[PDB]
C-alpha cells in the first residue's frame, strides 16, 4: 500500500481515493478528488491557486522551523 499525492494540489491520495489520468504523452496525473481535476482540466496553474502545496511552498507559507538549525555532526579522530 502506497499513499499517492495529487499532481495538482499535493493532497495525499489514500487507496481507492481520487482518480487517475493518463495524458497522451504517457504522463500520469493523479487527483485526490474532482476539484483538483476540474482545475487541472481548466488549465489552472497550481502556483496561482492559494490552497495548494505548490502555492504555499512558492509563497513561503509556514515553513517556520524547517530552516532552523540542528545537531547532526560527527566525531571520529582515527
Amino acid at each position: 500500500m502506497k499513499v499517492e499525492i495529487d499532481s495538482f494540489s499535493g493532497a495525499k491520495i489514500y487507496p481507492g481515493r481520487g482518480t487517475l489520468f493518463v495524458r497522451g504523452d504517457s504522463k500520469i496525473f493523479r487527483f485526490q478528488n474532482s476539484k483538483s481535476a476540474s482545475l487541472f482540466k481548466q488549465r489552472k496553474n497550481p502556483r496561482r491557486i492559494a490552497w495548494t502545496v505548490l502555492f504555499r511552498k512558492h509563497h513561503k507559507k509556514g515553513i517556520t522551523e524547517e530552516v532552523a538549525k540542528k545537531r547532526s555532526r560527527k566525531t571520529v579522530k582515527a
Binding site: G16, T19, L20, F21, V22, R23, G24, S26
Partner: protein, 136 residues
Amino acid sequence: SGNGAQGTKFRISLGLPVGAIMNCADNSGARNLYIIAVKGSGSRLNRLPAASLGDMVMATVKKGKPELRKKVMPAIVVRQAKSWRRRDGVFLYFEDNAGVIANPKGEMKGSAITGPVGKECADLWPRVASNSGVVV
C-alpha cells in the same frame, strides 16, 4: 476477445458502443477505426454492443489508406477515455480512444503502437505487449 485471448480479462467498464470511432494507433496506414461489433458480446433488446479496453471488435477504416478502407477487419481496443476501475481500487482513464487493427488470431498488422497502452490489454494480447512502448 475470444480467439488468441491468452488469459481472462476481468470486467472493465464499457466505453465504446457500436458506432464509436477511436484513433487507430498503429503504423498500418489507418487513421481511425469505426466499431461495428464487439466480439463475445451478448444480446438484450435495444442494447448496443460496447467495447472496453482489451476487447476485440470488428471494424471498418473510415480515414486511411484506400486499400485499407471499404472492408471489415478485426481490431483490438488499446485505450479508453471512459473511466474504469481496477481491482487495486483506482478509477483511471486515457485521454483518447484507440485500437490497433489485428487479425483474428490476435496478431497485429503494423509494426508499432503509437501511444501509451493499458495493461489490461497488454496482458491479454502478446503481440500487443511486444509492439507497445509505455504500458498504463
